[PDB]
Amino acid sequence: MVLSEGEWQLVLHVWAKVEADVAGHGQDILIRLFKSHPETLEKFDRFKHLKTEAEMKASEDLKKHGVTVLTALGAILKKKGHHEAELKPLAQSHATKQKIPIKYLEFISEAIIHVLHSRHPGNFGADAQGAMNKALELFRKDIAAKYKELGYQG
Numbered sequence: 001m002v003l004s005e006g007e008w009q010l011v012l013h014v015w016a017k018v019e020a021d022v023a024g025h026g027q028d029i030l031i032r033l034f035k036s037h038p039e040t041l042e043k044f045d046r047f048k049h050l051k052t053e054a055e056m057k058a059s060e061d062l063k064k065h066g067v068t069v070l071t072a073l074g075a076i077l078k079k080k081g082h083h084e085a086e087l088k089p090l091a092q093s094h095a096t097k098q099k100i101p102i103k104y105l106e107f108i109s110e111a112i113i114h115v116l117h118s119r120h121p122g123n124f125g126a127d128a129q130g131a132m133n134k135a136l137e138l139f140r141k142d143i144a145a146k147y148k149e150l151g152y153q154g
């Protein structure tokens, strides 16, 4: 798929607001994912002992991981579709080392959209949400193709 320039602008405008607090957004998004889809927590041997939201919020390791996730995603979105080299190592680690099905990438996409709508309602109306949803669908479609090339297809 291809996004128009106007669509990328909507995506990068709200992302610039996210980047004012990467750690905070990273925590919010992972916690949302784990709350909504507790089965995803089982993939993380470093976090699956965490029992409550309070414990998640207090976890420094969880916060650090949130920053890593959003820094990587930000680097991909800023390529505006030209992301083939960025996606190769991400695909390999999520396919071979961790085995993360595509369904779980949909779950985190939902979590990102929820947190952006909650923190940035003025910059995340219907048109901006649509554009962010297209950008994340593009990401998932390209990662799924790489999964298949790698032998997983998740």
Ligand code: HEM
Pocket (backbone or CB within 6 Å): 040, 041, 043, 044, 045, 046, 068, 069, 070, 072, 073, 089, 090, 093, 094, 098, 100, 104, 105, 108
């Ligand atoms: C927007 C989607 C995602 C991005 C940008 C992302 C990015 C990353 C990055 C950059 C790392 C660290 C280095 C590496 O191993 O590649 C990582 C590790 C990992 N990711 Fe993801 N990830 C995404 C989604 C997910 C999902 C949906 C799950 C599981 C439900 C997941 C599970 C893991 C695990 C288990 C690790 C290793 C954690 C550890 O070091 O103990 N990832 N991810």
